[PDB]
Design a protein. Structure first.
Ligand SMILES: CCCC[C@H](NC(=O)[C@H](C)NC(=O)[C@H](CCC(=O)O)NC(=O)[C@H](Cc1ccccc1)NC[C@H](CC(C)C)NC(=O)[C@@H](NC(=O)[C@@H](N)CCCNC(N)=[NH2+])C(C)C)C(N)=O
Lengths: 99, 99
């Protein structure tokens, strides 16, 4: 599919057994999902954005489906205001920018 | 061109006749450039991302070239960690996401 940028490029994702809406963010290196009770071990890390840093839990090898496309990778979980899909998973679904 | 996402989608821009490197960010509503002298009138506003809110200068109807493509629109100037090109100008150059 092709997604224009008139509006925020929101897509449905599946993670942790839950469907959610998330933002395809080419300016995000990583994937950050709003606070959810993901099972298993994780690692404390900090990530930064326009107005500073926030604390997140880093989970490896997390299965996620993005707009119907299967992926698996590192997912960060924490108090983000928007669920964000970053390059680490956008590359796995073959997404490009085109102009 | 078509741009993959294994690395950050960094491009050269020209603003106020000065060359800069900036990130194409589909997760940004707006365009935010690091502090610089820029010809034109501005108004103070707040923008937010991961980490919180910051203060920026809003300039409208600014001529800006992005990877050799022309845009004329709103440019926010302030303490951003990196130069970011958002949807307001990416739509002007015909950028889409594709997968
Ligand atoms: C496991 C590795 C962790 C390492 C870690 N890495 C990072 O912190 C990296 C650089 N961060 C990033 O790449 C983060 C995303 C988080 C992430 O992927 O980790 N990217 C970002 O935050 C990039 C800008 C950026 C790029 C590069 C460097 C720094 C900043 N912007 C993405 C961001 C998404 C939005 C939905 C919150 N967009 C914005 O911030 C734009 N804001 C807007 O569009 C607002 N109008 C929307 C507001 C939403 N609501 C609200 N706030 N209440 C702004 C740029 C005009 C580190 N410590 O450096």
């Amino acid at each position: 599919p092709q997604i224009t940028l008139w509006k925020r490029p929101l897509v449905t994702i599946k993670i942790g057994g839950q469907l959610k809406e998330a933002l395809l963010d080419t300016g995000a290196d990583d994937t950050v999902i709003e606070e959810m009770s993901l099972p298993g071990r994780w690692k404390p890390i900090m990530i930064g954005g326009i107005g500073g840093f926030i604390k997140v839990r880093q989970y490896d090898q997390i299965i996620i489906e993005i707009a119907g496309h299967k992926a698996i990778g590192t997912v960060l979980v924490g108090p983000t205001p928007v669920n964000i899909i970053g390059r680490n998973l956008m590359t796995q679904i073959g997404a490009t920018l085109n102009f």
